[PDB]
Design a protein around this ligand. Structure first.
Ligand SMILES: [Cu+2]
Ligand SMILES: [Cu+2]
Lengths: 21, 30, 30, 21, 30, 21, 30, 21, 30, 21, 30, 21
C-alpha cells in the first residue's frame, strides 16, 4: 500500500503523485 | 539526501501538498 | 459533536481523523 | 461540495464521514 | 476499522477538532 | 490519563469528548 | 521571543508547545 | 480572551503561558 | 506538480517536505 | 520573496526548492 | 515539567513558532 | 545538531532560539 511505498519503507515525492486524482 | 517515513497524518499532509487541487485518494487497506 | 471551519490541509487532517484506516477520497470541485 | 462548503461554511464530523473509504 | 494512537501534538489536534468552540482541557499528569 | 485512554492504548472519537468543556 | 498570529488548531499547537505536559485549558469565548 | 486576541491580534509565547496547567 | 497557497506554519511544513534533511532557510522579508 | 508570494500568490514545489540547504 | 523530543516536521513547527518573523535555519546535517 | 540538541535528546524553548535568524 501507500502505507507501504511510503510509511513502512520510504518513497519519492514522485511516488506520492501515483496517488493524485 | 534520503527522504523519510511518512505515517498517518503526516502522510496525508504530504499527499494534499503534492496533489492540491487535483486531490487524492488515501486508501490504507491497500 | 461540533461544527468545524476546515480549509486546506486542516480538512485533509479532519478526514484522516474521521476516516482513519478505512481511508478516504479528497475531491475538490475543479 | 465538501471541500468548498467546510471552508466557506462549517461542517460537522458527521458530514465528513460521507467521504470515507 | 481500528482507531489509532494519538500522541503529543496529534492528540490535542484531535481534541480541538472534536470539541471546537466548547473547548477542552488537556491535562496529561492525569 | 488522556495519554492513557488515548496515546498509550487507543480510544474512540467518543472518548475524546469526555475531555470537552 | 516573537509575537505570533495564532488561529484555530495552530493556537492549540502553540499551547501544547508552551505548556506541554504541565498541560492546558482551551477556552474560547462563547 | 486569549483565543480571540491571538487570532485577531498577535500574542507572545509569554501570554500563552497564562493558560498552562 | 501543483501550485500551492502556503502561509505561516504550512510554508515551513512545505520546506520540510521539499528540502527534508538537506535542510532549509526560512527568511521572511522584514 | 518566497514567504510573501507563496502566501499572497501560489508557488510550486519547484519554487520552494530554491530555498533548500 | 520536562520538555519533549521534537522530530522532523514537529521540530520545524517549533522553530517557526519560536522565531516567527526573524525566521530561522533548519540544517539537520549539522 | 538541532536533531541532537532537540530530537535525539531534549532541549529548552530557549535552545530553539539558538537557531533563529
Ligand atoms: Cu507527528
Ligand atoms: Cu492553518
Amino acid at each position: 500500500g501507500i502505507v507501504e511505498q511510503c510509511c513502512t519503507s520510504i518513497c519519492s515525492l514522485y511516488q506520492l503523485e501515483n496517488y493524485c486524482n | 539526501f534520503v527522504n523519510q517515513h511518512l505515517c498517518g497524518s503526516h502522510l496525508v499532509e504530504a499527499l494534499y501538498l503534492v496533489c492540491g487541487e487535483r486531490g487524492f485518494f488515501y486508501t490504507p487497506k491497500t
